[PDB]
């Protein structure tokens, strides 16, 4: 009873110390701001490798996802009589079911698992402790511009993932199956999408962008400075982000 | 402009042709020769503990979160049609047509696919692949060949639990959260297609998904840079190339046998 329970508490304290260090490091980077003209060349540098470098994975997979949902949606509407209504299941599925859920998993591969690499490699070659030593805080130079590079670029990349896969019905329905463009676009006009499907999708993509950035900027900072520890933290960044996007999806869909 | 921009664009075409031909020669020499099952059969259990059963945390923690969200969003779509008894037709079909083995290959490439690149490439940085190359059989048949067949018999064997938990996750949101009867919710799945269209076609979809994922994982770890800056660069390169090899393959595979 007691010999197997004493080792259970050893992993229960280290979980609270790991999750407690992610809140203490973030609270030190969310303090009273300096002059914003200094971080203006530092913001466009950290927005290039996160926003622009994760643009090809969003757009190319956007036309591939939207054509599958248009093709598979035509199978379940053949048994029904709503074959002309391809405005649903190509747009409404990419707004609440897919969209911010599936593209956040693809954001954790190109810009999520590479964000913990460029901050984890600096812990091994002692670039963080050398930059700290001279005159500057390390938590406000390599983490704070990288925190705003994920909470802003991912809601701006989610609408690109929506607006690319939403004209797959112009390819699958129109000029392939023969669905009328007036019977496809106007079926999407009459659907009530202003509050439940437009701004509720935008709130869901904002809080998803904070959870991916908080884990990606912590696994590279809290790591053993060696080649095996960076690659171990790079693997655990995708697992902790996939269980946080899908984990906070059942809770967030109850407030529809 | 007309010649200087062409001299570097075509040079990348030769480099991406030499890179694409190296992955074919790595998998061909790892599967032919002498297929004995005396030295590689204890190695098959060793390479399945860190790939197959180690990937169970993304099956129990997940699955119940993708199964309930397909029943919660499915119940809101099935409103004002009086088709709430047909919720099992929405759950048991979507896990075998669009979801299921497609999203499980993305989870396998980020958990077992990312760890496979960080295993061979970590060994070649400390010169472990070149050590066994001059004292025993070359490591293409020793440490690559059991790792290839481990991921092949894993992803079809892991997607059958993903489609069983998500159906069980859809049964939890159906009869215990919305209050529909269990007599007609399961009988709607008894009239759904589960032969020649849904159960066979999802198995062959996951077999071809279990080849293109592990091919990039065994190539970026074998063909990499021995410095530490190229190990993490090739680790994040595996997830991006496997996501285009699964979602890009799903468009040309759903055109066949689905209409």
């Amino acid at each position: 009873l007691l010999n197997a329970l004493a080792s259970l508490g050893h992993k229960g304290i280290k979980t609270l110390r790991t999750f407690g260090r992610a809140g203490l490091m973030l609270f030190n980077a969310l303090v009273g701001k300096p002059e914003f003209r200094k971080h203006a060349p530092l913001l466009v540098r950290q927005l290039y490798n996160v926003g622009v470098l994760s643009m090809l994975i969003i757009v190319v997979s956007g036309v591939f996802i939207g054509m599958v949902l248009g093709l598979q949606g035509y199978l379940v509407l053949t048994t029904y009589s709503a074959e002309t209504s391809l405005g649903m299941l190509v747009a409404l599925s990419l707004l609440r079911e897919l969209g911010p859920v599936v593209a956040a998993l693809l954001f954790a591969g190109r810009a999520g698992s590479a964000l913990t690499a460029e901050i984890g490699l600096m812990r091994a070659t002692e670039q963080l402790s050398s930059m700290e030593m001279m005159a500057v805080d390390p938590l406000r130079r390599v983490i704070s511009p990288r925190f705003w590079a994920g909470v802003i670029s991912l809601p701006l990349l989610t609408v690109i993932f929506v607006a690319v896969g939403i004209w797959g019905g112009s390819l699958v329905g129109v000029s392939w199956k023969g669905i009328d463009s007036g019977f496809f676009w106007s079926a999407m006009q009459n659907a009530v999408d202003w509050r439940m499907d437009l701004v509720n999708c935008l709130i869901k993509s904002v809080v998803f962008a904070i959870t991916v950035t908080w884990i990606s900027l912590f696994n590279g900072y809290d790591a053993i400075p060696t080649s095996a520890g960076i690659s171990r933290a790079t693997t655990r960044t995708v697992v902790h982000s996939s269980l946080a996007v899908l984990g906070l999806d059942f809770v967030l869909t109850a407030l529809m | 402009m007309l010649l200087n921009a062409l001299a570097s664009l075509g040079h990348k075409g030769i480099k991406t042709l030499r890179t694409f031909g190296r992955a074919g020669l790595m998998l061909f020499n790892a599967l032919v020769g002498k297929p004995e099952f005396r030295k590689h059969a204890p190695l098959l259990v060793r390479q399945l503990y860190n790939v197959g059963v180690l990937s169970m945390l993304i099956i129990v923690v997940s699955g119940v979160f993708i199964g309930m969200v397909l029943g919660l969003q499915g119940y809101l779509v099935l409103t004002t049609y009086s088709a709430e008894t047909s919720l099992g037709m929405l759950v048991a079909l979507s896990l075998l047509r669009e979801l299921g083995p497609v999203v499980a290959a993305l989870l396998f490439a980020g958990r077992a696919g990312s760890a496979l690149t960080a295993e061979i490439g970590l060994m070649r940085a400390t010169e472990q692949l070149s050590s066994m190359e001059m004292m025993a059989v070359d490591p293409l048949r020793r440490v690559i060949s059991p790792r290839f067949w481990a991921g092949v018999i894993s992803l079809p064997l892991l997607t059958v639990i993903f489609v069983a938990v998500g159906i069980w996750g859809g049964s939890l949101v159906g009869v215990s959260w919305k209050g529909i009867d269990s007599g007609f919710f399961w009988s709607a799945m008894q009239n759904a297609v589960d032969w020649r269209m849904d159960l066979v076609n999802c198995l062959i979809k996951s077999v071809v998904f279990a080849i293109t994922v592990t091919w990039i994982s065994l190539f970026n770890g074998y063909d990499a840079i021995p410095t530490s800056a190229g190990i993490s660069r090739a680790t994040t390169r595996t997830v991006v190339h496997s996501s285009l090899a699964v979602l890009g393959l799903d468009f040309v595979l759903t055109a066949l046998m689905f209409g």
Binding site: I13, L16, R17, G20, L24, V251 | -
Partner: protein, 131 residues
């Protein structure tokens, strides 16, 4: 101190997140009928078209074999006379059925209905019109 400082900040961040999780998951009567039709649990009861509450359960009398249902009415409208009537009407033309309280010209907690009308039956609508 650092070892004893990262524990209290970890149990306070999880307590604030679980408190944010609990906020993220957010008088009865009786009526004895002859036929209920297609009413189910949590079915709306209305008067004049506007809803005032819902029903709780739909049970059966073990002796007289008549369907007796229980409803609920909020405290905003209390002055209802005891000569009211209950009519079985459906929403629209073929939608889900509701209960229309046809009030007449004191109802406490635990009273029964008086003028209960039977539900619509399609088998007599083609029988009385023919025969």
């Amino acid at each position: 101190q650092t070892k004893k400082n990262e524990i209290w900040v970890g149990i306070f961040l999880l307590a604030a997140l679980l408190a944010a999780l609990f906020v993220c998951l957010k008088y009865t009567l009786y009526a004895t009928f002859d036929n209920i039709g297609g009413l189910k649990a949590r079915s709306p009861v209305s008067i004049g078209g506007v809803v005032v509450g819902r029903v709780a359960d739909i049970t059966l009398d073990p002796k007289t074999y008549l369907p007796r249902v229980t409803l609920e009415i909020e405290q905003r409208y209390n002055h209802i006379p005891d000569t009211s009537s209950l009519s079985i009407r459906t929403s629209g033309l073929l939608g889900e059925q509701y209960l229309a309280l046809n009030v007449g010209f004191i109802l406490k907690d635990g009273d029964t209905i008086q003028d209960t009308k039977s539900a619509m039956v399609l088998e007599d609508l083609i029988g009385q019109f023919l025969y």
